[PDB]
């Protein structure tokens, strides 16, 4: 009811907590900060502007600005303008996908692919409505 909304929040928290730890090294190895790995992952799906990243993230623009250019200086992202990605940034995303796909597998080895399929389409539909509602305000 609003149980679900709490579960979801708690679930997202848990997923972030696991991602932070699982990625502690690759981030370090790269100079990268957590909040920067995130931006690097946000750009993994679409190009942005400091403004778009700041809307989609809700944190004061300056902060997004501090990291946006720390990332350019490191040749992880690139201007075209907009915020794209370089291999070093892709390869990081590929190294991030490798770890991620590895434990995710470990704990879903016993799942039923069909039970997952219907679950997926329920969510894909909710994802659709989330994006769509966000478009306005």
Ligand X SMILES: CN[C@@H]1[C@H](O[C@H]2[C@H](O[C@H]3[C@H](O)[C@@H](O)[C@H](NC(=N)N)[C@@H](O)[C@@H]3NC(=N)N)O[C@@H](C)[C@]2(O)C=O)O[C@@H](CO)[C@H](O)[C@H]1O
Among 7, 14, 29, 34, indicate the residue that binds ligand X (CB under 6 A). Answer: 34
CA-CA distances (angstroms) from residue 23 to 9, 96, 105, 111, 117?
Answer: 21, 7, 17, 25, 28
* Minimum gap (Å) between residue 19 Cβ and ligand X: 4
Tokens of 122: 């329920």
Query: In this structure, are residues 96 and 84 in contact, taking their beta carbons and an 8 Å threshold?
Result: no
**Beta carbons within 10 angstroms of residue 70's beta carbon:** 16
Among 26, 41, 61, 88, indicate the residue that binds a second copy (CB under 8 A). Answer: 41
Q: How far apart are CA 35 and CA 67, in angstroms?
A: 8
**Beta carbons within 10 angstroms of residue 39's beta carbon:** 25
User: Does position 29 bind a second copy by CB under 8 A?
Assistant: no
* Minimum gap (Å) between residue 86 Cβ and ligand X: 16
Q: Residues in the site for a second copy, rule: CB under 8 A? A: 1-2, 4-21, 23-24, 33-35, 41-42, 44-45, 55-60, 97, 100-101, 103-108, 111, 113, 115-116, 118-120, 122-124, 126-127, 129-131, 133-134, 137
Binding site residues, ligand X, CB under 6 A: 9, 12-13, 15-16, 19-20, 23, 34-35, 37-39, 41-42, 57-59, 62-63, 65-66, 96
């Amino acid at each position: 009811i609003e149980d679900h909304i709490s579960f979801l929040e708690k679930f997202i928290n848990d997923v972030n907590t696991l991602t932070a730890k699982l990625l502690k090294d690759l981030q370090t190895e790269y100079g990268i900060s957590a909040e920067q790995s995130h931006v690097l992952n946000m750009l993994s799906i679409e190009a942005l502007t400091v403004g778009q990243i700041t809307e989609k993230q809700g944190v004061n623009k300056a902060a997004v600005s501090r990291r946006v250019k720390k990332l350019l200086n490191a040749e992880l992202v690139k201007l075209e303008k907009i915020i794209k990605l370089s291999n070093k940034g892709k390869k990081y995303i590929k190294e991030r996908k490798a770890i991620m796909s590895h434990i995710a597998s470990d704990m879903t080895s016993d799942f039923d692919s069909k039970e997952i399929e219907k679950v997926r389409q329920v969510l894909e539909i909710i994802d659709y409505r989330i994006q769509s509602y966000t478009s306005k305000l």
